[PDB]
Ligand binder design. Structure first.
Ligand SMILES: Nc1nc2c(ncn2[C@@H]2O[C@H](COP(=O)(O)OP(=O)(O)OP(=O)(O)O)[C@@H](O)[C@H]2O)c(=O)[nH]1
Ligand SMILES: Nc1nc2c(ncn2[C@@H]2O[C@H](COP(=O)(O)OP(=O)(O)OP(=O)(O)O)[C@@H](O)[C@H]2O)c(=O)[nH]1
Ligand SMILES: Nc1nc2c(ncn2[C@@H]2O[C@H](COP(=O)(O)OP(=O)(O)O)[C@@H](O)[C@H]2O)c(=O)[nH]1
Ligand SMILES: Nc1nc2c(ncn2[C@@H]2O[C@H](COP(=O)(O)OP(=O)(O)O)[C@@H](O)[C@H]2O)c(=O)[nH]1
Ligand SMILES: COc1ccc(NS(=O)(=O)c2c(F)c(F)c(F)c(F)c2F)cc1F
Ligand SMILES: COc1ccc(NS(=O)(=O)c2c(F)c(F)c(F)c(F)c2F)cc1F
Ligand SMILES: [Mg+2]
Ligand SMILES: [Mg+2]
Ligand SMILES: [Mg+2]
Lengths: 427, 124, 427, 420, 428
């Protein structure tokens, strides 16, 4: 019924800044000012994402955390920088190190409080606080490390309210660091304990959607962030729109996660892409369903073939004959009837909203709790065990104050999460 | 026939006389008892003080229906009252204890960064 | 010497009411009591103007005695001598004898005694009552036992109304009859049965009355009774006293019940037809159609016969008549007693109620015969009785007012006895 | 010699209100005032049904009881409402429930007293109280339930005096409730112990006289009550008329009921609706014309009272009546002699030049109870709707007790098709 | 006498919102509260209180733990109808789970509601009972409703409670856990109700599609239909006329056993705007297609039947109709209880919402039947439940708000029991 946003670490922020500027456009908000747009609905739920301040003005409920100036002055000197409250920025000065220990223990918990001090202000000045959602990288340190710290420090303060993360799972192709495995695994363990849902955005997947289907040669952190921003908008829609009726995000949880551990969703989007490549809008509903459900079109690098669907949420977009949505959606659970678990009845719910995203006459987006996710972790825990092998780059953590066996512990834990997703291809 | 009539008495406003016709031809209620009259009064006063102590019979049970009705109602209310308070402060004591059970792993993986940052006090 | 009438219970009352009427006409006493010894046998010359009957009237409902103290004659009796008792006997002996009787008996018995008190040689009692019906059967019985106690020698003559299916009140009638007649029995001396059916029959053939009233019947009975009491109100040989009544008629203490046969019953309007001969009326006496109790005496035998003539008669016709009643008939006399006919003439011509149904006659006869034939009615009754009691049919109403099942047994027992006695007198 | 009237429960009152307005017309009484009519007899026995008060005025000896305002303001706002004493009405406020337990125990004995308080006030100011008669439904709660309670509370106060009821015995066709069996059976037991005569008015019968012989399509509680009101008038005639002589109502009892239990009369009426003597006898004696749903063929007559009406050659009545007990001689029990008595009264009812009405103690009644005890055992079977009583404070086996008792009354009506 | 409505939770609220609407049309009360007809200077008085000297206020209370839905009421005309008081809202959701609704978020608001209700009882000279409208699935509908009923049971002795539940359907559904919630409440909820009117959302949705032509029927589409069925049931005792005229009485006819509450409703002519014989509508009542809970009653047996007519009817036809319902169909009456049909006619012709989807009818029927057949929905539900709990599928969300694993065990235990009871009424 009203939610705060933490946005930490280089990737966390580059994503967030785009997310924000995308939604700010759905509702219609100036760089600073307020509403300008012939639609009316918009501000029904503007409440949820925008704590509004003096004059007109609509300031977003956003904390930005980072461990160096760097990518904060990026947002402030760029797209929609005039929007975020001037002191919802928590700086860093020091390094991130691109090192989880640094982020989670030393250079991070150094800061930590001044972030909590600010989350406690926005939250304490909520009417009925839904919970928190956080964006961040999983490999590389300030994003994952301090992030997982923050959530651990957020629970405890607010066990109460629910925990949501957009967590970009890192990959060999399009990565800056030999250590990503470590950083990812160490947080993956943290997440399984401390959040209630995590959106698994695979950086691997993202890139694949750009070469394998997009004729996009050399992909920026940009036309890639564009995917997540789009994905995020469509995932959040129900929290911030209709009157049909509401999405508690607590409701989202209770309905999507059968078992307390397995909150790992693969998102997926309907139509995709960019500039002088978008010319389609020949997107149809049939052609829209097949596409939002195609493995080639997940936001996590894993084909939901190996592994069935536990529960699925799917949410369309744009004034279209939803009479047809119902029966197309029903066709997906028939031409694929086997791949939706038999023991959770009516386990895919679909909703429509009739206000299109940026461009695009028609759209849709898909949230899936799938055991196909199993594959993702395996594939990080496979290049991880591969390093922890003869204890590779570890000394960077060893001597930041961290324990030899605290890795085996996070390795163990995650390898279990693989074991359980596997336990659930049952009878 | 031809009768023979013996004349028994002549009078002022009358006169009797037999006529034997043909020869004939052959050769203490006591008191005491309205002792009876009151044993009827007695057998009445019994038989009727009976179909009366038979109706005090019919009565007392009247009370007992009206009374075992309401009596078995304070059964329902004064049992559904503490089938709640001791299943709803059984419940409140449940999650209240479970909230701490959570705040616990979290006080511990906390006094753990404390324990291995006082571990960073050794690096040469 | 003197002579007290008692009339107990509706039937009894109205009968009386209509003979006292006749007596008054016969002695020229106006309802105001005043006329302008002889007949002192029935009346007391109280005050110095009036005449008051030596009578007492009792009923447990006021209704009937009430009517007497409305209609001229209202002046005739003493306000005292008419006792009434608030609640009914409700058609059953048991109630009359024990339940409602008991109460009033003490008053009645005393008031009666107040009449005895002004009688210098009181002779006995004439009790008028119904056979069936509650107070007539019930109270009468209680009375008679008591009367028997308080009055030693004194004869008791009863005039009972033997009930008939047609003009009847009650279903239990038989029970009440057999019940009283049992108790009632060894307290009476001589008893005049009046079969209501016969009376009703004489009225129909002989008077022309399509459906004869109670007061229609009563007038006729008035006559028969006035014929019987006659002898002791004018004094004139043959039954000048109540002693003589049993002497002359009843030869066995048990066998009380003589059979009366009143002479010319002929309707006014016939009033001018040439009168009937001394022989005809005499003969009319031997006609069962002109009888007073529905039975057949040329069947049973005769054990004592009496002919009470009233009017213009020299005995030398009375004789000549009897002559040819034998010459031309069923003689019928029983084995061991003369061939009687005690004949009384009382010169006083019979008067009749002026707006009545019977015409003024020159000479009338009466004939009291104690014939075993009358036992026909004794059976006709018992068979009704027997065949209800055979099922306790109404017994429970008596045991109700606290009587004994065994009393019925015991009272029927006596009628079996009587019916035997009676037949056991033939040959 | 003077009688009070209790009139309890929706049916009880809808009947009573009609009965009263019918007789009040025979005697001739204004809505309020007194006599207006060229006849004279009328007020001879007006005593019996009308305790009379100040001015002229003739107020009837009536208590009206109910467990909710409803059908009392019905009578007061309608036909002859201005007549009953303003405080001879005992209200209810609460429900009846259409539930015997409610009526006989809880919601009823709640009131009870304020009724007795009033009955005691009419009775205590009688000259010679004959007894009480009560009208009421037998299925449905306030009528039967509180009623049977009332009579039980009336005996005990007055064992003494006799108990009379017009009790309407409910049926499948023209009924509102699934529970009627229970309510009826429960009171039937009650009645057999506490009254001295009950007129068995079968609601089934009533309806039958409207379709089978009436051409009356869709019958109200109205043109049906009209039958009972007519039947009641003619049944009571002997209490409130002649001088030939009287009917003690005690006398009625002692003469009609041979056995203490079997006081169950089927009434019958002569002409009907909304006539010669021969045609009048055949008709008052026809099964098609009883007030109880039972053909007096199966079952003989114990005792019968029949009472004609209207200036007519009663010479012909005698011999027509005798003809009925001949062309049917077999169907009047042999062991009660002269067991049918007939009387005439020569003042006609509402309309109708000629009339007649018949009271019969007949073992054909046997069939009525069977037929209620047959839809009753059918329910008590797997203990049907019983929980509505169970938990109003009543006993499991108090039903078996009333079932038993009544099933005996069937047994005895049967015992009496006997011999000689 | 009087008669308080409670609408707990979204579904409950909107249903009520749409019969209170209908009641107002049926008695000529403008949203303004004021009505220029009859008196109040009773009849209409069972459900309304003549408060002030101009207005009419429903004897109602609305509760929901999210404001959203109750808020809408205090926006759109009717806003004027209720008292600002009587609509309670609760800041935070129930979040689609009983455990939350019954213990965690309920607990708080229950004390206020229970009292406000009491404030309505306070102005009722012979209050008769409560009509509770709620969903079967859904958090506050199952959860709070339960808590309420226990409490109501305590605070109000005799007083009958009638529940109108919305038994949930796969298609027009909110939550996955729906089954859990339903079996959970229905267990607690069970021995606190007296008689309960199930509305199978699927069937409603089916009636709207075949009979109304609505390609994909709205919530307010369905509600209009339910409004009608409810108004047909409450009808009887909103005017007073012929049959079914106090709360014990009405229901003493439907349940034979302290369990077996749930009668089956079948509304007569549902036909779309843009007449039928007394016999036709009568017959339409025995068509499972025109039914009100997805099941099959020429299968199970009948243990009590009720026919509630509304409009222009002499019983002469009503009879003649019933005749040929028996000559030409599956009679089906159970062993040990008459062959009922309590027939009630209320002359008041059926009014319909003016810009609605159903046309003004001359005469409509209702038929409430307590048939063992309705147990079909009791299983159709349990099998859903059984096969989730078979794996603790979502249990952990309840134990979260501090519930007991054993309560599921215990609550299912009862449906096994019930499903037995029900089938255990057939044949001798
Ligand atoms: N001959 C004749 N018989 C009558 C008369 N009145 C009644 N009866 C008969 O008497 C019998 C009934 O006796 P009742 O005198 O009526 O009864 P009761 O108990 O003495 O008087 P109640 O107090 O009125 O009951 C029946 O056989 C009637 O036919 C009458 O006036 N004349
Ligand atoms: N018939 C009908 N069913 C509804 C309506 N709204 C929701 N439902 C159903 O009710 C169930 C969900 O109950 P809800 O009222 O939504 O849940 P709730 O907890 O009671 O209300 P919330 O506080 O909004 O969560 C599902 O079976 C829905 O199909 C409605 O307006 N009409
Ligand atoms: N999609 C997305 N992923 C990013 C972005 N920047 C870095 N990443 C991924 O996240 C990981 C590094 O995260 P980073 O934010 O640089 O670490 P931090 O600033 O120290 O928290 C690498 O595996 C990258 O692939 C971004 O711009 N968008
Ligand atoms: N004939 C007659 N019977 C009625 C009347 N009203 C109800 N009944 C019958 O009596 C039974 C119900 O009695 P009722 O008076 O409604 O119950 P109560 O008011 O609670 O005592 C049903 O079987 C009806 O058939 C009436 O108007 N006249
Ligand atoms: C798995 O089926 C469900 C999945 C999620 C939810 N929860 S929700 O209320 O927050 C929700 C929707 F109901 C919905 F229809 C959506 F499209 C959606 F994105 C969503 F979160 C409810 C469900 F029944
Ligand atoms: C069985 O026949 C009788 C029925 C009743 C009575 N007693 S009664 O006084 O109550 C009575 C009548 F005698 C009578 F002729 C009636 F018509 C009558 F209604 C009546 F009650 C006497 C009977 F012989
Ligand atoms: Mg008598
Ligand atoms: Mg009623
Ligand atoms: Mg909810």
């Amino acid at each position: 019924r009203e939610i705060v946003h933490i946005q930490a670490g280089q990737c966390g922020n580059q994503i967030g800044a785009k997310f924000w500027e995308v939604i700010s456009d759905e509702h219609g908000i100036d760089p600073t000012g307020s509403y300008h747009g012939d639609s009316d609905l918009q501000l029904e739920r503007i409440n949820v994402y925008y704590n509004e301040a003096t004059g007109n003005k609509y300031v977003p409920r956003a904390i930005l955390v980072d461990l160096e100036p760097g990518t904060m002055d990026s947002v402030r000197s760029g797209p929609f920088g005039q929007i975020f409250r001037p002191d919802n920025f928590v700086f860093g000065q020091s390094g991130a190190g691109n090192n989880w220990a640094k982020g989670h223990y030393t250079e991070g918990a150094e800061l930590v409080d001044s972030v909590l001090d600010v989350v406690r202000k926005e939250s304490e000045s909520c009417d009925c606080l839904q919970g928190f959602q956080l964006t961040h990288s999983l490999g590389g340190g300030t994003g994952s490390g301090m992030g997982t710290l923050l959530i651990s420090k957020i629970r405890e303060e607010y066990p109460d309210r629910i925990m949501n993360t957009f967590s970009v799972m890192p990959s060999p192709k399009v990565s800056d660091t030999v250590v990503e495995p470590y950083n990812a695994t160490l947080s993956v363990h943290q997440l399984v304990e401390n959040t209630d849902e995590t959106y698994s955005i695979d950086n691997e997947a993202l890139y694949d959607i750009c070469f394998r289907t997009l004729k996009l040669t050399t992909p920026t952190y940009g036309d890639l962030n564009h995917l997540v921003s789009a994905t995020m908008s469509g995932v959040t829609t129900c929290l911030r729109f209709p009157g049909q009726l509401n999405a508690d995000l607590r409701k989202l949880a209770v309905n999507m996660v059968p078992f307390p551990r397995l909150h790992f969703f693969m998102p997926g989007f309907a139509p995709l892409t960019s500039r002088g490549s978008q010319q389609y809008r020949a997107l149809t509903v049939p052609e829209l369903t097949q596409q939002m459900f195609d493995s080639k079109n997940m936001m996590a690098a894993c084909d939901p073939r190996h592994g069935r669907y536990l529960t699925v949420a799917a949410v369309f977009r744009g004034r279209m004959s939803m009479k047809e949505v119902d029966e197309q959606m029903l066709n997906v659970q028939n031409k694929n009837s086997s791949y939706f678990v038999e023991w959770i009845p009516n386990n895919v719910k679909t909703a429509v909203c009739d206000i299109p995203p940026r461009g695009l006459k028609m759209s849709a987006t898909f949230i899936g709790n799938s055991t196909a996710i199993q594959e993702l972790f395996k594939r990080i825990s496979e290049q991880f065990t591969a390093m922890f092998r003869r204890k590779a780059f570890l000394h960077w953590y060893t001597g930041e104050g961290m324990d030899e066996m605290e890795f085996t512990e996070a390795e163990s834990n995650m390898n279990d999460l693989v074991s359980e997703y596997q336990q659930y291809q049952d009878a | 026939a031809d009768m023979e009539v013996i004349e028994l008495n002549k009078c002022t406003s009358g006169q009797s006389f037999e006529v034997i016709l043909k020869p004939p031809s052959f050769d203490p209620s006591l008191e005491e008892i309205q002792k009876k009259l009151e044993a009827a009064e007695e057998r009445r006063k019994y038989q009727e003080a009976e179909l009366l102590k038979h109706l005090a019979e019919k009565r007392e049970h009247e009370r007992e229906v009206i009374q075992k009705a309401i009596e078995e109602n304070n059964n329902f209310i004064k049992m559904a009252k503490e089938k709640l308070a001791q299943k709803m402060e059984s419940n409140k004591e449940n999650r209240e204890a479970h909230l701490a059970a959570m705040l616990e792993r979290l006080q511990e993986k906390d006094k753990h960064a404390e324990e291995v940052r006082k571990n960073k006090e050794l690096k040469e | 010497r003197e002579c007290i009438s008692i009339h107990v219970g509706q039937a009894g009352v109205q009968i009386g009411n209509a003979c006292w009427e006749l007596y008054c006409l016969e002695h020229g006493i106006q309802p105001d009591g005043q006329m302008p010894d002889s007949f002192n046998t029935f009346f007391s010359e109280t005050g110095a103007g009036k005449h008051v009957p030596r009578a007492v009237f009792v009923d447990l409902e006021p209704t009937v005695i009430d009517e007497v103290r409305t209609g001229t004659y209202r002046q005739l009796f003493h306000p005292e001598q008419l006792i009434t008792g608030k609640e009914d006997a409700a058609n059953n002996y048991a109630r009359g004898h024990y339940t409602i009787g008991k109460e009033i008996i003490d008053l009645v018995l005393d008031r009666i005694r107040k009449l005895a008190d002004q009688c210098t040689g009181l002779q006995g009692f004439l009790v008028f009552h119904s056979f069936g019906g509650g107070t007539g059967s019930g109270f009468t019985s209680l009375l008679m036992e008591r009367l028997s106690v308080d009055y030693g020698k004194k004869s008791k003559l009863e005039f009972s109304i033997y009930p008939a299916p047609q003009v009847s009140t009650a279903v239990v009638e038989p029970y009440n009859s057999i019940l009283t007649t049992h108790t009632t029995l060894e307290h009476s001396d001589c008893a005049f049965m009046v079969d209501n059916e016969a009376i009703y029959d004489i009225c129909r053939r002989n008077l022309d009355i399509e459906r004869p009233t109670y007061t229609n019947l009563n007038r006729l009975i008035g006559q028969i009774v006035s014929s019987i009491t006659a002898s002791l109100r004018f004094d004139g040989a043959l039954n000048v006293d109540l002693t003589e009544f049993q002497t002359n008629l009843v030869p066995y203490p048990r066998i009380h019940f003589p059979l009366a046969t009143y002479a010319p019953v002929i309707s006014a309007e016939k009033a001018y037809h040439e009168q009937l001969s001394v022989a005809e009326i005499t003969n009319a006496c031997f006609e069962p159609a002109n009888q007073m109790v529905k039975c057949d005496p040329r069947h049973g035998k005769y054990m004592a016969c009496c002919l009470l003539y009233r009017g213009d008669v020299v005995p030398k016709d009375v004789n000549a008549a009897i002559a040819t009643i034998k010459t031309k008939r069923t003689i019928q006399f029983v084995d061991w007693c003369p061939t009687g006919f005690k004949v009384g003439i009382n010169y006083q011509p019979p008067t009749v109620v002026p707006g009545g149904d019977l015409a003024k006659v020159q000479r009338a006869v009466c004939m009291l015969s104690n014939t075993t034939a009358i036992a026909e009615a004794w059976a006709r009754l018992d068979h009704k009785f027997d065949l209800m009691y055979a099922k306790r049919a109404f017994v429970h109403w008596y045991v109700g007012e606290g009587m004994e099942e065994g009393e019925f047994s015991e009272a029927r027992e006596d009628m079996a006895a009587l019916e035997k006695d009676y037949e056991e007198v033939g040959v």
